[PDB]
Amino acid sequence: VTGSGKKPWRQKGTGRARSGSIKSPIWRSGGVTFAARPQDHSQKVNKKMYRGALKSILSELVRQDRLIVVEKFSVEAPKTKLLAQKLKDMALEDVLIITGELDENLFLAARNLHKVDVRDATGIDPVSLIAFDKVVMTADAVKQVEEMLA
Amino acid sequence: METIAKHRHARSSAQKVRLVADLIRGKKVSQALDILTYTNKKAAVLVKKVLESAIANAEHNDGADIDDLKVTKIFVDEGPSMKRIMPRAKGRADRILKRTSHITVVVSDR
């Protein structure tokens, strides 16, 4: 705290309480005994624990019929109107678009829609497989996520 | 018809004005003005100015009947305190309060 290290008043003699600095935490304009510092909250996850959790997440997805595997998923143009036309015909509104090969033609079309997200097959995470209601697989992404989990 | 009439930020403590205000509670305006005329207090002329202001508001702003008009409710509420410093002996300071009050006078016909 920006201030002086001078003792406010005498140790004895005065009727006031014993004080040594105006920067004390029991004083106004300065305090906070255990002040926070910029720290790291990330905690270590074992490779077998992370891979084991993803396999258990994917195993529950097929038990809740939320995993929909398809042969291919690609739009002809980056327009979001025709992408929004696509998944509405298969009765999906809030899905996680995961494909084996991330194409910029599909990346641009799903950038504005809030309830969908496009990722690469190597870049999967647990939380998006849980937060999103449904999740759709293309044919070659299944063979790529199978070997990365093993 | 109530016709409230107050005087906020009166330069006097509420304790001194409550002594004067207790004299005219439940009295006719004719008798209350006569009582306040011969009362030798600073608050006596303070609340008399409010009372005649309350009487005039009871004839111009609304209603009538000045003679049949009774001071039903009267009270003095303390206002903000303006605080000064009185230099005392031994280099010490004693802080004084210039106490104010809100003299509210409401007078009706019944």
């Binding site: 005065t14 009727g15 | 031994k90 280099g91 010490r92």
Partner: peptide
């Protein structure tokens, strides 16, 4: 806000 002159001390004794 100043302190006080402190109470005048008495003559301290010894053994």
């Amino acid at each position: 806000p100043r302190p006080r002159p402190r109470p005048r001390p008495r003559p301290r004794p010894r053994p």
